[model samples]
Target: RTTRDDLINGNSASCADVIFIYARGSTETGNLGTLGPSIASNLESAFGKDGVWIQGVGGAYRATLGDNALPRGTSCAAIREMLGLFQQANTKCPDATLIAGGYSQGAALAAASIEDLDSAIRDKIAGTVLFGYTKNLQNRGRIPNYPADRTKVFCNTGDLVCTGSLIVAAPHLAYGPDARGPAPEFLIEKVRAVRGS
Candidate 1:
């Protein structure tokens, strides 16, 4: 389990010009989850960690049954923690860019934070990425106001979670490794553009 103290102290010494907040999938570990860790791994492989800082949102809302409410209380508290970190980072490094991402329930949390952020804070965001987002919220347009070109959504072909079908274990679990294919490059591209790197 990640903690606010861990994240605040985890910023790399390599001049972190971009902050990446990654949320885990439902019932997944707060540190990386199934796909978030790989995405960061690939991103680091491509660009190194010199200019990037990866922070895992810490929350325990991931229940085993996976039927917990969206942005469960703990998850909401985690979002608040993230928002505070964003503010603090922005205050310290006004030019630092931010990227938000997550999987499943975590996705909804990130999306809600993005939607509710003050314009000033939101302006620092370079991109948003979501994997296995619930079709329930997607259909209802829970995530809005993010730049279209910078946002990417990845929903596996038969992912019942993103398709509004009865929950199935296979597709929901299929996003583990392959989901890293496009996310790292997409994020790298966006961050470079934002940072003029």
Candidate 2:
């Protein structure tokens, strides 16, 4: 219920050294909500607020059970839009280190589109951070071909959604400060590894 409408459109006005293309969870108000904002803040804390660009994908796909229960996993329109945002970030700041992420239904979108990413755009992504990853059970905690080393998936205890249940439990909403799990640390590492210290 805690929604941040401020960054909903994200920083499309300009690019930064790092680009965070993210999708929010089901019914989570802002385009960046619950889990995404904390991690984005962590990156800004590390790289300076000016170093990162957060683009929340815009769409109307309601992330209900029907939304995720689909055979393809998530809406194709959202995937195309997210990928387009990805491409735009690269075009705006080709040399910027890039990372992506999502939560719940949004996680399904990232998981699905990333699997379809071509090597050219795929290689530019340094890391992907997922919380309560909706496809965790389906993909075995991995976003296929995205490289495990560069991806961080956080599924808390009793998180059924990640287990493929999609029941939407308390654990699913408990990833806020799990950013203190310092999930952003992984991205920081990957970022430095790519763009250098």
Candidate 3:
């Protein structure tokens, strides 16, 4: 259980116009292996030199990696953490937009958080990019009117970690030729362009 400061570095840049939240998954229980690094690189490319408010919450077994309990399973901690971080960022850069994103379980957490965030602040959100999650609940009434157009769900149709009943009614884009690489970043760019990010 290491503090974010211990595992990840935080930076401030006057050019920052957006905050990007990155989701962390359970490396101990199951290995997303390369997906994590892929996500980080894609995001770094997305923001370029702009300040990115990265968050790696959850994942890492309860007794293994974090001080937090295991199976955070769509809990409030990630939302709370993002809210607090966004608030602080807004204080520094009032015009900056906040973009929340998650991969796998992280995406689920972002979905849950948006459902509860204040509408005013939520309006300031630029976009939410989710990777590898397919459950109906995440689509239908999970997060009412989740600005679906602004949310991008990326998954490999055959990815074993992405299929199942946990996700409900969630709309997603299945990407193929991903084995060739960079497809995820291309998708995010597409979402950002379409969503005004």
Which candidate wins on TM-score?
2
Give the residue spans of candidate 1 off by over 4 A. 1-7, 10-14, 59-75, 135-142, 165-168
Q: Could you list the CA RMSD of all candidates, in the order they appear?
A: 3.5, 3.0, 6.5
Clashing pairs in 3: 135-167, 135-168, 136-167, 136-168, 136-169, 137-168, 137-169, 138-168, 139-169, 139-170
For candidate 3, give the lDDT of residue 170.
Answer: 30
Q: Residue-wise lDDT of candidate 3 within 81-186, one digit each (tens)?
A: 6555555655655665666655555655566667667777776776666666433233642344467755666665555445554332333323223412554454
Candidate order by decreasing lDDT: 2, 1, 3
Task: State how far residue 43 of model 1 sits from its true place (Å).
Answer: 2.1
How much does candidate 2 score in TM-score? Answer: 0.87
Point to the candidate with the largest lDDT. 2
Separately for all candidates shown, the number of backbone clashes (residues 3 or more apart, or on different chains) is 0, 0, 10
Each candidate's lDDT (Cα)?
A: 0.66, 0.75, 0.49
TM-score of each: 0.80, 0.87, 0.61
What lDDT tens digits, residue by residue, belong to model 2 across residues 1-197? Answer: 23332233445454477777778887766677677777777787888876776667665545545677776567887788777776776666667777888888888888887888877888888988888888888899999888989889999989998777868778888887766656788888888887821
Across 35-64, the per-residue lDDT of candidate 1 in tens digits comes to 777777776676566656677766444423
CA error at residue 2 for candidate 3, angstroms? 12
Give the lDDT of residue 173 in candidate 3: 28
